[PDB]
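Section: Multi-chain targets

For targets with more than one molecule, the full set of components is provided together so that the structure can be written out for the assembly as a whole rather than chain by chain. Components appear in the order listed by the source. The example entry contains eight components.
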Amino acid sequence: MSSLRHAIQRRAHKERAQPLERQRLGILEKKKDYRLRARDYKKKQAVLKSLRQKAAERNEDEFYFGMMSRKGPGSALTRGKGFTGTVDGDRGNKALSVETVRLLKTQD
Amino acid sequence: KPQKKETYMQKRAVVVGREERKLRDLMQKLTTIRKEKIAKRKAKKEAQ
Amino acid sequence: AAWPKAEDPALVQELLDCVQQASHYRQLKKGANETTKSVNRGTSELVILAADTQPLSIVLHIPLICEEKNVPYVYVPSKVALGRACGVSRAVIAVSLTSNEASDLNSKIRALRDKVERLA
Amino acid sequence: PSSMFFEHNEALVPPYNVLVDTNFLSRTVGAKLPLLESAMDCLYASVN
Amino acid sequence: IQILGAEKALFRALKTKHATPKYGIIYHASLVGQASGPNKGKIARQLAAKIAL
Amino acid sequence: GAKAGKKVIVEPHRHKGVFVARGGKEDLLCTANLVPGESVYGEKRISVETPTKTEYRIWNPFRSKLAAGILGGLETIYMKPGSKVLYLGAASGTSVSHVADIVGPTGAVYAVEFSHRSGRDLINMATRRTNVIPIVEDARKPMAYRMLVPMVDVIFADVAQPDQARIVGINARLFLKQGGGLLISIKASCIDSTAPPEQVFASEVQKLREDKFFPKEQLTLEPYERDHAMVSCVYLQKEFEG
Amino acid sequence: PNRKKEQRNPRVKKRKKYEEKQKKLRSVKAVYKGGEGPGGYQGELSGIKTNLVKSVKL
Amino acid sequence: ELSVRVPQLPGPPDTLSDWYNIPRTNLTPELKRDLQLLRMRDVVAMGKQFFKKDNRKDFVPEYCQVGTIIAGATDGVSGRLTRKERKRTIVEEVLSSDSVSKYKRKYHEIQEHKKSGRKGYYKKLMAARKR
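Its structure, encoded as tokens over all components, is:
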């Protein structure tokens, strides 16, 4: 049980460190750090597998009405060197009319 | 996309004073300490 | 002027005996300003006021705060006897004896303030 | 409630207030047992 | 002369790029008190120019 | 502490007429001052210059059992602005000023005091506030002020008497509407000095129920006063107004 | 096993158990603990919450 | 006697009728700083004084009014802020108070704990490998 064990039965076992001749390579990854690494990789691969399923089973004739108010991801040919697959969003700025810029420049 | 050119509404911004920057820095420090304290309290309550 | 005056038959001496008991128990405030401060801080359970005071307006000003805070007050007829009962070596005209959460004096306090509430 | 120190009711001091249910009352008449006398002999104190 | 007296709001607005006050002491004259709406500010301008002359 | 000159903001409470002024390190309770620019008993008050005449007055819970009950968390206090309140046990008019400041100019507070010098202080503060009328009479005999008190909506009862339930019973039989709100402040050491306070409170609630009230809330206002309770009850109904 | 300096004395253990169970009581109910101090009323020193009803609904 | 009338025909309430007309919040940036300070007043007194955890989604109430304590007539020697301490906002009073160094110390401990292993650590590991 738990009362049938001495304090030397309860005593913790210490963890060894990376050798000092090899400490420049980083920390010695043990089971806990390996579990963190494996959890992060399995999570990222699960998201990527779901994205690959969604890109495979895509209707080529789909029509949402946000397509008339968004700029598409395009291709590398149409966009150019600045091509990421992400749809570009708006930063909030807008082209500003001349009367309001006349007001702002009088204030400045 | 992070904008690289500087817009006119960024060029015409008023340089803020010293007292308002001290109040801004104090509000930054208080909000960070509040967020860390809230995360610690929520972790303790989740353990219980 | 002192309408809740204590009468003779073994009520004045019960009051002064409880006063001496509380003064031994260190649960008692002496003098007009200390009675006033104890009533205004609300720790007072009962307050004894002398009635033989040269001009009586002092032990007339204390009953207003006692009636506002609703604590019992009662007049004993001798400030010399009140000072002798407290153990002061001076004449005391106002005595307020406070409340504590654990004592055996509080039974005497409770019976005394029941008799005083019947006197009023 | 006041006078409760961690499932110890300090409000109950003699004379004890005792609520009586119909099952207790039918069985204390059935067992030839006087009600207030047996309650006082159980608690060693004055009940109402 | 249009914004004499409204100098606190004036220099606050000029330093924070807000909109300046339209009038100052001139508001409690007779001739700017008959107008209503934006004609109040227009009459304040015209009255301040005539006051300067 | 809550020093003079600190800036506070004043938000409304859950109750009507009461506000809570919070700021910095101390949140306090306040009521809108009826006569602005003057304190009754030397309390801290709160001036706000609206974009002058607006002032709020701080409500001491250690001095007044109603503010002690409000900070304890009563479900309602029955006194909206414009409701008549019969105050029994209006000793010197300290909390009666805050009740009058709650009920406002269109309400009325009938403040009954028995002693005479407390009556002088009450007549002074009711000279200041024109909606509290002072009645120097014994609350045990409500035939004295039946010309003065019309049928009120709320009764406050802060009398420290052993016959407190009978006093409130006859006063509410004479001057309380059908379904009338009242708040009674019970002091266990003055009701029954020998018995435990929870048993004293249950006995007083049972006596009110025999005297035709229906009790709906009860709190022991403990961090402000020892062995005190505040019992809220409705006269002759289950709901408050109708 | 190794036991505590508190456990070697049965009175001091029952002193520290009472000090921490009187401490756990203040976190549930409200103790009186003296009225207003000598300084007066410095405000309700730890918050006022408006939407909280703490009365025993009879 | 009896005159021609003036014809005056051309949402949420402005003033509360039941609370003696508290005006609606003019949500200035200083009042917004004050309200953020009031929801963070547990952090301001750094553990010396804890507060009732009132955490709604919006900290700005609908009706507020920024006022000032005037005077308690019984206490006026130490319960009264001096002329060099009566400041304009509440945040200015917090900044004029002490323990601003205490806030900065706690902020720098949080900043070390949050820069503990994120990306400068990995830049240092990559440089030590490449050397």
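Chains B and G do not touch (no CB pair under 8 Å).
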